[PDB]
């Protein structure tokens, strides 16, 4: 058989970055050649596993972490990087084996009037442990005074919408991302 990369990369919708999807892939032969040989992928870079020798190494399991981030925010999807995404939404470990693609997705994702399907975590009292997602959605108390779960001044909702527009530049346009990992 073959691993279901067609379901992943060619899917219709991707999860937002803060609640990124995680797909476990196993018990199949994975043909990375079609992924490597694609003109659409405006990003393909990876670590400890050469892109040529992808079809040479068998791992116990393979993950496919998919999400959608802003175009200018892709550089933070890299081991050891920091930023909004790396610190609060999706953190990659320093010993990361497996790798990352990203291709512009403006037509699929950005619609006139704002696409509120995509969100990212904005505040968090502590940086994420690597490969760990949080779904806590309590009103973030950024001041000393309590506010009891009522959004207002000094208490900000921790999620913010990307608000993709087709008229944005390539910096702010949506980039679907897939972060493969191995054993």
């Amino acid at each position, epitope marked *: 058989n073959l691993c279901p990369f067609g379901e992943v990369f060619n899917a219709t919708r991707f999860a937002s970055v803060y609640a990124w999807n995680r797909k476990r892939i196993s018990n199949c032969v994975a043909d990375y050649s079609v992924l490597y040989n694609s003109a659409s992928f405006s990003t393909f870079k990876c670590y400890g596993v050469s892109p040529t020798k992808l079809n040479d190494l068998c791992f116990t399991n393979v993950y496919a972490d998919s999400f959608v981030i802003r175009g200018d925010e892709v550089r933070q999807i890299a081991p050891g990087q920091t930023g909004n995404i790396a610190d*609060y939404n999706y953190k990659l470990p320093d010993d990361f084996t497996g790798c990352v693609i990203a291709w512009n997705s403006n037509n699929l994702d950005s619609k006139v009037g704002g696409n509120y399907n995509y969100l990212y975590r*904005l505040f968090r*009292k502590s940086n994420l442990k690597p490969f760990e997602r949080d779904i806590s959605t309590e009103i973030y108390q950024a001041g*000393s005074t309590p506010c009891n779960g009522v959004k207002g001044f000094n208490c900000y909702f921790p999620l*913010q919408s990307y608000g993709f527009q087709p008229t944005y530049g390539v*910096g702010y346009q949506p980039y679907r991302v897939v972060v493969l990992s191995f054993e």
Partner: antibody
Amino acid sequence: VQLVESGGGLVQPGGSLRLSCAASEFIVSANYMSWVRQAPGKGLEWVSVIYSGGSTFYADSVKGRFTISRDNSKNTLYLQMNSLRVEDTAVYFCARFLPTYDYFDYWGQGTLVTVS
Amino acid sequence: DIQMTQSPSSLSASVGDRVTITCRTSQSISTYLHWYQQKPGKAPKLLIYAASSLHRFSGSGSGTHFVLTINGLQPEDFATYYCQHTDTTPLTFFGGGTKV
């Protein structure tokens, strides 16, 4: 909310000087904080920022010299200015950067850190 | 690296006049240009954020041209006004600043 920064003085070039913003109602362990310096007669220039998780960033002209940090116990924000030069003589504001539309909500008052 | 441009600078002290400040930016920032009003001797005051929403001033613009408008000028607003924008690579760039 009365962010008050203090610690300005005169330090010979290449010395080291400490700035301290003392937040009144904010808690620096949660908010993003930043230092913005205005050279005499010029406009504002960014210096550093510290995220809620502790991640820090620095401007190109001050990377490797200043270090921003905060202490939660007394709710204070620190800027370890080291390797001071002639062009660091300015006024240092501690702002309250907001991850949203990314703007400096509330500002400090001004401490004239001078070099001579 | 973004490069901003505030034109014009040191406007005319004309009380009760529509005052206009523009901020041409070298690259397309969507709605991420914020307007600060730094009175002399004080710290900036955050008139506007998102280039449109207040915090009488009325700002507008997107992409490359952003405008700060003071429909009714008061003798209490003869100050210096700055832009702002933060790159995704965390870097805020302040504009040159215009007097009034």
